[PDB]
Amino acid sequence: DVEEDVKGKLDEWLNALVHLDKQQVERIYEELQGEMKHVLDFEIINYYKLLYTRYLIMKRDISALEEELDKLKKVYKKYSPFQKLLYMYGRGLLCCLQYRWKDGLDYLLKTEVMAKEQGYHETGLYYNIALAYTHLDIHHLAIHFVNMALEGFRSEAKARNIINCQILIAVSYTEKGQYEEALKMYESILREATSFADKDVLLAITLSNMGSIYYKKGKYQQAKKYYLDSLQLQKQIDLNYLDTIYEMALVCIKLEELEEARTLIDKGIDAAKQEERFNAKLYLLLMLRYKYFEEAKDYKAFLENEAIPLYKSAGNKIELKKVYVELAEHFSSLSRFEESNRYYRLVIDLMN
Amino acid sequence: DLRDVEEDVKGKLDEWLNALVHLDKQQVERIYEELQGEMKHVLDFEIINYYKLLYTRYLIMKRDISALEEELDKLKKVYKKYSPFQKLLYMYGRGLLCCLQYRWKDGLDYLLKTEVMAKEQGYHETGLYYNIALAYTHLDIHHLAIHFVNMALEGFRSEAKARNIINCQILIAVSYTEKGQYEEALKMYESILREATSFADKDVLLAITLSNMGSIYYKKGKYQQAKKYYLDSLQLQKQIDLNYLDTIYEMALVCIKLEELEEARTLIDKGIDAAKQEERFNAKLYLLLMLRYKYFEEAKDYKAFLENEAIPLYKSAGNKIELKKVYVELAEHFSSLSRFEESNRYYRLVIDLMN
């Protein structure tokens, strides 16, 4: 009977896990570990076990999540409709963390239809669904859920999530649509003045995209300022950082600033050798240096003997296509259209 | 009085809806002719337009594209002020319109918005999921195609509609075929060979399966098997339609690989005359005509037909899939005539269509 407070304590831990109050999550997680050893009601135990999976995604532990999620898998039959709900939710987030967006979406969609049946709501769910749809390129459905997520997030007055939705919205309308509508969304982010944790991380991304938008619009001077501001906001060395440098180095070329361009390129290269995680990005910067600061004779040489054989290792995306097009454009520029056709045909075979 | 006249019409309109959703052709035609004698009595703006949107679905079922536009272009400006369900009917009809016109990318765009409106109104249609996946198939986006058939599949399962369930299985095996997994697709088609016998239209199910199987044996290299599966498919094709033109076009290619040109030459002429009759087959008519010129007409005449008739036709209608095919043939042609610069030109054009 005394474990009915733990039942309520498990519900309190649920609130801290939904609104992501990490300071409250940790104190309850510790308090429970001592009290969870005594209680032996499996509708109360499996409650904690599933909330732990929710705790694991907050602690970004994929491996431990996979372990536990596979354990609860067999016990799924005898769960409560709400406990059944949490399992489907956890696997969705797992696949999202494993970037299996199609598999995650299936789980997250079931997570929605269960929540509706038993009359349960969580604003984070809509966001994840929207993030799922977005990362696998379904625009209309992504926008649908990200609005409902945004509506709920405004009612909860959490500015961090507000921007996250606004970023997604602006990104989607940028992928296929007018930039003037996407720029105002980014502009709305900058005007926003509620200071929170890692707001500067979001602004770094916001500025990075605006730099890209204005780069496509031809407005190079403005784009460079946005790239510059982004870089100085960036505190990491992640993939998003190497992108902005590569993009900014392009702007310097457009603005007849080959010195600043090469400097940025060299820094990108030096920062890319650091890890094998972005080994692909490394050669993108090399190609850029051969293209503008080396002989075209050597640029072709690097593309044929270094670039192409590198992307034998899962360069299947734009990277390998990029190398083929550049070579194709190279020969057709020298009016040597035969070799140009050869590489052009390879581009078609790749985009099968 | 006039008031109860409409009350019964609304009921009869809702009945016409379910017949148009569950595809009851004999029931659709029945209510359709009945409504025409009743719809001239009702004058309610809400009810009249409700009928007009439903009438579009009739035109889709009757596959009357030329009349399908006129009804939609008549509503393209004012539909925004209708009831929210009338919008969904408009977006849906417009979506399938693009599909019937082989503008799948545009069709998908409308269908996806239709699904968004579906969730907004608390009303979904399992048939919609299928069409979305069908559009996703022609766009070669198979991972999303598979995503939507599974929703349609489980939808069709709960609705106990075993016939449409098979349609999903066929579509699944199609994506697997394009995904390179030929063996798992064949074994999937064999399972349909047993399932087919349970339905009335079994002969049209076999013709499709035997066709798609023959296509797999064609991609493997087993051409002698390819013809046998195609021949059995054609022998069941007693109805001249889209599927007929697919089988007879694909078989012609098989007779080319088997160096049986005379039979291939015969098949094309039969397929050409078939497509000339109904103008819904213009896409495949000029596709069949390209085969006629590629092998049995001189190269210059083949080139002339591509530049002056093929491209203009596939440019008028946004049938980019076929326009891609024409560009490659022109690119490969000039490449043989050592006119690489003009060949190179078309290679740049075909890449733009893939982005």
Numbering used by the authors:
A (entry chain B): 67 to 418
B (entry chain A): 64 to 418
What does the paper say about this structure?
Previously, we showed that this process is regulated by the sensor NprR, which, in the presence of its cognate signaling peptide NprX, adopts a tetrameric conformation allowing its binding to specific DNA sequences and transcription of genes involved in survival of the bacteria in insect cadavers. Here, we demonstrate that, in the absence of NprX, NprR is a dimer, which negatively controls sporulation, independently of its transcription factor activity. We show that NprR prevents the phosphorylation of the phosphoprotein Spo0F and inhibits the phosphorylation cascade regulating sporulation. This demonstrates that NprX binding switches the bifunctional sensor NprR from a dimeric sporulation inhibitor to a tetrameric transcription factor. Interestingly, NprR contains both the HTH DNA-binding domain and the two Rap-like additional TPR motifs, and was thus proposed as an evolutionary intermediate in the RNPP family.
We thus used the truncated NprR(ΔHTH) form of the protein, deleted of the HTH domains, which are known to be highly flexible in the absence of DNA. Because crystallisation trials are performed at very high protein concentration favouring the tetrameric form of NprR, we also used the (Y223A/F225A) mutant that has been shown to impair tetramer formation. Crystals were finally obtained with the truncated double mutant protein NprR(ΔHTH)(Y223A/F225A). They diffracted up to 3.25Å resolution in space group P 21 21 21 with 2 molecules per asymmetric unit. In both polypeptide chains contained in the asymmetric unit, the 18 α-helices and the connecting loops forming the 9 TPR motifs of NprR are well defined. The two subunits (called apoA and apoB) display the right-handed superhelix conformation characteristic of TPR domains. They are associated into a stable dimer characterized by an overall interface area of 1113Å2 and a solvation free energy gain ΔiG of -18 kcal/mol. In particular, the dimerization interface involving the C-terminal residues N407 and Y410, which was observed in the NprR/NprX complex, is conserved in the apo dimer. Comparison of the two subunits of the apo NprR dimer demonstrated that, due to distinct crystal packing constraints, the pitch of the superhelix formed by the 9 TPR motifs of the protein is larger in apoB than in apoA. This discrepancy, characterized by a Z-score of 7.9 and an rmsd distance of 1.99Å over 293 aligned Cα atoms, reflects the elasticity of the superhelix and suggests that, in solution and in the absence of NprX, the protein dynamically oscillates between distinct conformations.
